[PDB]
Amino acid sequence: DIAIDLGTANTLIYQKGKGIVLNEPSVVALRNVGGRKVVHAVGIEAKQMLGRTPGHMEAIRPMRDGVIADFEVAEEMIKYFIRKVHNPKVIVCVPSGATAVERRAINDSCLNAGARRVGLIDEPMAAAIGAGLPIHEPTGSMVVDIGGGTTEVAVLSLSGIVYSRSVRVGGDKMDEAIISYMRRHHNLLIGETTAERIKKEIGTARAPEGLSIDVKGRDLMQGVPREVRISEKQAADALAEPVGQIVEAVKVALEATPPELASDIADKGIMLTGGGALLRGLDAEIRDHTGLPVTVADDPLSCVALGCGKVLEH
Numbered sequence: 001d002i003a004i005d006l007g008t009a010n011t012l013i014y015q016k017g018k019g020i021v022l023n024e025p026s027v028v029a030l031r032n033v034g035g036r037k038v039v040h041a042v043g044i045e046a047k048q049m050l051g052r053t054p055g056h057m058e059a060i061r062p063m064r065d066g067v068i069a070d071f072e073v074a075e076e077m078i079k080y081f082i083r084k085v086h087n088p089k090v091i092v093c094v095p096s097g098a099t100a101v102e103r104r105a106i107n108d109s110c111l112n113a114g115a116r117r118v119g120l121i122d123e124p125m126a127a128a129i130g131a132g133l134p135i136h137e138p139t140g141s142m143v144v145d146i147g148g149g150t151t152e153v154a155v156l157s158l159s160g161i162v163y164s165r166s167v168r169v170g171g172d173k174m175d176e177a178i179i180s181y182m183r184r185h186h187n188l189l190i191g192e193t194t195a196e197r198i199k200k201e202i203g204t205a206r207a208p209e210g211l212s213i214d215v216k217g218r219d220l221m222q223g224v225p226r227e228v229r230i231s232e233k234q235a236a237d238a239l240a241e242p243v244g245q246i247v248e249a250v251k252v253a254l255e256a257t258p259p260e261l262a263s264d265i266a267d268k269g270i271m272l273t274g275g276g277a278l279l280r281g282l283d284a285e286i287r288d289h290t291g292l293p294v295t296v297a298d299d300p301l302s303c304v305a306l307g308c309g310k311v312l313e314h
């Protein structure tokens with residue numbers, strides 16, 4: 001009786017008639033204890049451990065690039081979360097491009113985690129539903145859902161997918177571009193938590209030098225902590241490659257769209273969902289390159305889960 005948005009960054013569970021009852025980082029901490037590995041923390045508590053664990057301890061993200069990588073740890077993650085909210089029927093989101101291998105792994109791990117039955121829903125369909133798009137109508141709707149692992153672009157109509165594609169670019173690749181930028185341009189080593197803070201605070205899809213923030217890491221030359229100031233322009237330059245990928249995926253989708261649906265999209269524009277939809281200026285950038293209106297869904301982190309939930313209610 002539940003819907004699971006199983007994401008690289010965040011897992012949400014919608015329960016029938018209750019709405020979203022769990023919203024937690026997709027993180028599992030394991031603790032070494034006599035050669036054996038026990039689950040130590042899952043969720044919010046484990047996320048705060050990333051880049052900060054002592055020797056006996058490991059913080060893991062078992063979902064990468066939109067799909068299950070480490071199946072044993074993902075199963076423990078799903079079990080933990082399903083237990084926390086309580087045999088149910090489950091529907092789970094999956095990237096539209098997920099291969100047959102990747103889909104069977106979600107299915108098996110949910111079955112292994114407790115599910116009686118499992119249905120898979122394509123992420124951009126869920127995202128569109130949850131962002132309030134009229135996906136059941138004979139009209140073209142286009143959604144772009146930018147997560148931590150993948151960016152999903154789709155055109156939907158009549159309760160189905162007209163076009164869809166998953167590209168392996170999103171928030172994680174953005175963080176990695178920022179880490180690489182700090183190393184190459186400032187000879188400073190920063191971690192994933194600092195990179196994500198940069199991205200959220202001054203990260204943007206188009207150069208303005210603009211605002212700035214101070215971050216800390218390890219100075220590579222001196223081997224001591226050092227504080228560096230980074231500007232919106234530098235963050236813009238670091239993010240230019242992944243942002244350009246997302247934009248090209250949108251253009252590719254538009255070229256594949258049947259002309260009457262293209263006509264519909266010209267009116268309605270494009271809807272952005274997912275945590276990556278909050279990247280400053282991403283809406284304007286897509287607008288510039290396509291000619292179309294671009295709207296950011298309200299609370300885009302939760303569109304997929306609300307979409308899966310509405311399916312549960314019908």
Ligand SMILES: Nc1ncnc2c1ncn2[C@@H]1O[C@H](COP(=O)(O)OP(=O)(O)NP(=O)(O)O)[C@@H](O)[C@H]1O
Pocket residue numbers: 006007008009010011065066067146147148149150151170171172196199200203273274275276277278279280300301
């Ligand atoms: N304000 C922000 N600006 C830029 N990026 C953001 C912002 N807020 C969150 N993010 C990113 O959004 C991502 C999380 O979004 P989310 O939609 O939950 O992805 P997901 O479902 O967990 N991953 P996926 O499996 O690829 O769909 C992370 O990479 C965040 O860093």
Ligand SMILES: [Mg+2]
Pocket residue numbers: 006007008123147148274304
């Ligand atoms: Mg997602």
